[model samples]
Each structure stands twice: as structure tokens, then as C-alpha cells.
Target: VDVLLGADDGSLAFVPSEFSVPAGEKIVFKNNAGFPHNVLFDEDAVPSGVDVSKISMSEEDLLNAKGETFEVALSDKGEYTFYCSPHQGAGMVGKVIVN
Candidate 1:
């Protein structure tokens, strides 16, 4: 599935802050605002999901100098939280609900 990155306020964010998908799914986040973006999952108990090796999201990996993408594979259930690496403190956060 393809989702959006960046907000209308010129603040970097996930367009749909909350999303839902099956327990196991792959989501691709697109850099819609043409800004540098990266998805960093919150660090917690679900370490495998937070920065899972499956998605290959390096801490230094950013999206869009040319409007690019970030992708993740979700295997764990329940709620998952994420934030933009560069704008994490600016309310550039999002969540995913696995149903």
C-alpha cells in the first residue's frame, strides 16, 4: 500500500496519521511534499518492529531530494508508531493499527 508523507502546514508529517492494515502488510510512504523524509519507528518492546531489519530503514536513510520513498513490512499486530527522523519533535508522527 502507498501512503503519504508531509502535511499541509508546511510541517513534515504523515498525511494519514493513523492507518490500518492486516497483521502482515507492507506499506510504502511517499514523499509528497518534496522534502527530505524518513520513517523511524518508535523504540520499545517490539524491537523487531521498531526498526526491523526486514525493511532496511537505516537511521541515515532519508527520502526525497527528488521526491522519493520509504517502505516497511509490518508483521506484528496491535498499534505501531512512527515519526519522521528529521522532524520527530515537530509533531511529525504517525501510527498504524493492525487489524
Candidate 2:
């Protein structure tokens, strides 16, 4: 499945900002607006055994992520709250409810 970063209205946000998925599902985050964005899963917001921090992108990677894709596999049963490092202030946040 794919999640879009930003929209056609030039809004700094995610499409379908909240969603759910089964464990072991993969989600691809795409930069739809060709803007710098990176997914950062809140360390304390994820499941106990899930270490989303390891999936974080570097500054350079984030800036050049437009038109690029980042994939993540969900394996724990819990909520995952995330945000775009550079656009969080613009309310670029999203959630993943894993079951």
C-alpha cells in the first residue's frame, strides 16, 4: 500500500492521515508534492517490541526524498504515530493502527 506525503493543494500533510493494517504489511510513503519529507515514528508511541527509530531517514535522505519512496513493514499490534521531520509544524502527521 502507499501513503502520500502532501497533496495537490500544496498542503504539508499526508493523505488518509490515519489507517490500519495487519501485521507484516508494508507501506510505501511517497512524496506527492515533490517536497522534502521524512517519516519519523515516535519512539514512545509505537509498540513495545517495535523499534521504529531504526527506520528513520537521515537529513540528506529526507531532503532528496521527493519522487522517491520509503518502505516500512509493520509487525507489531499497536498504534504507530509518525510525522515528517521537516513539516511537522505544518501538521504533517499520521497514524498507523496495526492489528
Candidate 3:
């Protein structure tokens, strides 16, 4: 599996800024920090009005560690919104544009 890192700069932001993946494949959101952070996919292409915050990611899904990884599958084509839970309101957001 391909692993990706989201470094926290004390603000709601991703270190890499942007990412691209293939359809029908999966990307791992690995939080290389111990702070409280999460990746949420909030996009229009997904079911409209779906509350990503309410969605419970598995322990393996929450990348709150230096070696933890969140495996997510992208079956459809669209942009996904991901962010750290505590940092979302602070603008720690990112996008996964799948083509």
C-alpha cells in the first residue's frame, strides 16, 4: 500500500497540499503525528449532504500516530475533502481529486 503523510503546522493544513489517485484504488492517510487529527472526505460527488464528521472511521482509519494509516477506497470519480478533525474549523483541509 502507498502511504501518505499529513504534517500539522499548528494550523488546519496538509503538508503536501494536494494528491491524486486512480479510480478503483485506495490511498492511505497516515498521520505521522500523535496529535488529534483526521481525514474527512466531504465532496459534492459523494452522496449530497453526507455528514463525514458523523462517520466513524475505524481505529485503523484514524491516522493519529507516527505509524498509523487510514485506508480509504475511491470507487467514483470526484474531489474529496479531507481535514483534521480539530483543525477543520481552522482551515486544515485538503482535497483528493480522483480522475
Candidate 4:
């Protein structure tokens, strides 16, 4: 399913900071703000989500302004936490509730 994630403050922050989706569906994280931001899945208790800490994927470079998109496949059901590499500790964190 195509769920929209946007930064409401025009900063590196995202609105509706949490989202839910079913397993086995593709999640396209679209950057709607004029600043750079990344939607990273930072944990790996589950096998289907992206591992942001390993550097296997360029989680830090995925941030963009208007025409950027980050795509990932949710293959397992679990609670996942993510953030923008430069904005996570600054309150740009979000959650993915996979069911």
C-alpha cells in the first residue's frame, strides 16, 4: 500500500510520526518537505525490515527535498523504530507498526 509521510514544519521533521502497514507490502516513504530527511529502520529483531545501523544501505544519504523516495519491503510483523540520520535525536523519529 502507498502510505504518505510528510514533514509538516518544512524542516527535517515528519508529520503523523507513526505509521502502520501489513507485512509483505511495499512501503514508499516520500519526502514532501524542502529539506533533506531519511526514513530509516534501525532495528533487526525481524528479518524483513532494513538495518540502518549496519551501513549496508545508505540510510544517511537518502534524505531529499521534493522528488526523493525511499522504498522498503515489510516482510515480517513487528514494531520498528526509525529516524532521519541527522534528525533522529533532534526529534525526527518515527515508528512503523507492522502487522
C-alpha lDDT values of all predictions: 0.73, 0.81, 0.60, 0.64
Candidate 2 residue spans exceeding 4 A from truth: 63-66
Clashes of each: 0, 0, 3, 0
- TM values, all candidates: 0.79, 0.89, 0.67, 0.73
Better structure of 2 and 3 per TM-score: 2
Model 1 residue 97 CA deviation (Å) reads: 0.8
Q: What's the true lDDT of residue 45 in model 4? A: 35
lDDT of 1: 0.73
TM-score leaderboard ranking: 2, 1, 4, 3
Off by over 4 Å in 3: 1-12, 43-63
For candidate 3, the TM-score is 0.67
Query: Model 4 scores what on Cα lDDT?
Result: 0.64
Candidate 1 lDDT by residue in tens digits, 1-99 = 777778646667788888888866878887887467788777652434455444446778888653577777787777777778788888888888877
TM-score of 1: 0.79
- Compare the candidates by lDDT and give the number of the best one: 2
Alpha carbon deviation, residue 91, candidate 2 (Å): 0.9
Q: Name the lDDT of candidate 3.
A: 0.60
Tens digits of per-residue lDDT for model 2, 1-99: 788888868788887799998988998888888487788888878888887767666645674546688888888798999889888888999899989
What's the residue-level lDDT of 48 in candidate 4?
A: 58
